């Protein structure tokens, strides 16, 4: 039972890709329709590396079972102390507290880099994610109704926020 | 008259925008925009077929308005975020209201479902205006911005276009 | 500026009544239609006294500007460590932090009496109350839709909860 | 057969109820009910015109069900909370489902808007049953109950009767 949270590396990308694409195909966790390609994912990784944005993976028994990152919330200079994060856990690996460990690590990194405000965009249907965020003292800041459309129904996006100060 | 913006409008638009940058929390930016960035913005919007409207009176552009993507993921397809800016010397004339009205007309015509405004929590006139046009307060993100040495709260207001 | 939070007394009831009835007439803060009578309010007070349930008032310059209490959440013996509270502030006295001071006092009393769980039933429209409760680390536990009917529209009741442990 | 309960049913009902008190988290009560309290409950429900249904088979009451007030304030007028109890020896027979079906029929006929179930978070069969009848999980209150030396979570499930 060799389990560890570490920064992601290039050799992780394929695993990461699979996880992400599963989420695209089966859930509203990603407001995307088409599976991402490996080149798109590699460009994403290189861009995160250039921007000094973290990517963490949860790895167990040689397998990447989850990943997490943060970056810009809205693209305007005065949002500089605000970041938005995302967390994805393999569907075969749920119930193991992997999301919780990833979020914990994200928060420690966010505090160490001096950000003020951490934002989660969570689909209103994502009950486990909402519960997890409430556990870490995120406050529900609002809900934008009918902002998304997927699987033939309208989607509501809830914003949760943590004051890192 | 409210008409679509043309390249010849750009300088005036820039001025309005930069005033808002320098003096208000209406734009979460610190440094003035340059005319080159504005021109690039214009051409990009022409390319994306996003509308830009100006309010013109006595040959002078007194306000402008536009809408575009709210968040950049494909499933946000039917959601747009709008922006309105009115010349500081042209307040009180109902310009922002006429622009918002025009934006809403354009948004319905193009088949969008949801129109979103990010309004600074202190912009009470804008809030009152959007309430008047039946926008609902969707929420408020606190301390999301930082300008003029203080923390800024962003209120989200939404209109269902259906 | 003589301001104080104290336990309520009989001589407070008239003031309390007015506040309550204002809330009945103008808001969804009380799922009641008809104004309460002074005898009903006195019976309420006597009952709270018999049950050792607290009633606090915020008093300033000789005037009761707010009141607050807690009691049973659901009537079955196994809910004994759970209480539900309510807070009412005079409409002429809003924005003074009176609700916040009352809630603070309620929480200290709840902890001192060994309860585990404090519950707020808040109308989904009551934004100030929701914000106040989030401030004191209540978690939104759920929302019952169309449970109430008042002023010709359907009402949603949100539950917020604080773990007192 | 599912019929309205009669006084002669009460003893059987009591047994069922008390079993649930003694062995499960289905009733947030510690001590067995007495037949006097049950009779008072029955007469009170007759008075309030609240329905009580029993599932009867081979002359034996194998389950019962009822609904009544959810919260005690006038504006909760169109909301009811229901309860279903099935004999422990009569599980697997679809009794709870037939009772719920009957309750829903009765609730619509009487013009209620919202039907509410308080279900212990560990009662997975009840949850699955209510999901089957299109109840929505409205929320969960954690640590609201205490029984058998542990903390209990109450899930609320709701059906819009319109």
Numbering used by the authors:
A (entry chain A), C (entry chain A): -2 to 162
B (entry chain B), D (entry chain B): 1 to 162
Which statements did the authors publish about this structure?
SaGNAT protein crystals produced in 1 M sodium acetate trihydrate, 100 mM HEPES pH 7.5, and 50 mM cadmium sulphate diffracted to 2.15 Å and were indexed and integrated in the space group C2, with unit cell parameters a = 97.5 Å, b = 78.9 Å, c = 66.0 Å, α = 90°, β = 112.0°, γ = 90°. Two central antiparallel β-sheets (β1–4 and β5–8) are splayed between β4 and β5 to create a V-shape in the protein. This signature feature of GNATs is stabilised by hydrogen bond interactions between water molecules and the amide N and carbonyl O atoms from the protein main chain. In the asymmetric unit of the crystal, two SaGNAT molecules were present with a buried surface area of 1,397 Å2, strongly suggesting that this interaction is biologically relevant. Briefly, the binding interface in comprised Ala75:Tyr28/Tyr146; Tyr30:Gln77; Arg71:Glu81; Thr140:Ala138; Thr114:Thr142/Asn143; Thr79:Val144; Thr142:Glu158; Asp160:Asn143.
The Gcn5-related N-acetyltransferases (GNATs) are a very large enzyme superfamily with more than 10,000 members identified across all kingdoms of life. Members of the family share a common fold known as the GNAT fold, comprised of 6–7 anti-parallel β-strands and 4 α-helices in the topology β1-α1-α2-β2-β3-β4-α3-β5-α4-β6-β7.
